[PDB]
Design a binder for this molecule. Structure first.
Ligand SMILES: [Zn+2]
Length: 56
DNA sequence: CGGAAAAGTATACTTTTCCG
DNA sequence: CGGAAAAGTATACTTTTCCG
């Protein structure tokens, strides 16, 4: 176990330290940044439709 | 007030390393 | 030398806010 370089929560449902230099222990900083860094992959949107296809 | 897009967190699949 | 297990990586999928 390590720590995030922004969050800091030992109980990480799924880590992301990625042996390199920094240690993004959390899954929030990397995955949430999808839209906050650039154009989030439309892949997650394609399945997102699963909700939008039921009611609209 | 409702729906659409943003957002967020878990999970599913995958990989990398260690040890029998 | 290969299997196993946890971390890694990103999409999946449901909720919420906000504007039409
Ligand atoms: Zn973080």
């Amino acid at each position: 176990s390590f720590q995030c370089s922004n969050c800091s929560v030992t109980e990480t449902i799924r880590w992301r330290n990625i042996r390199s230099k920094e240690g993004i222990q959390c899954n929030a900083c990397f995955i949430y940044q999808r839209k906050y860094n650039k154009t989030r992959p439309v892949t997650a949107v394609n399945k997102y439709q699963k909700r939008k296809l039921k009611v609209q």
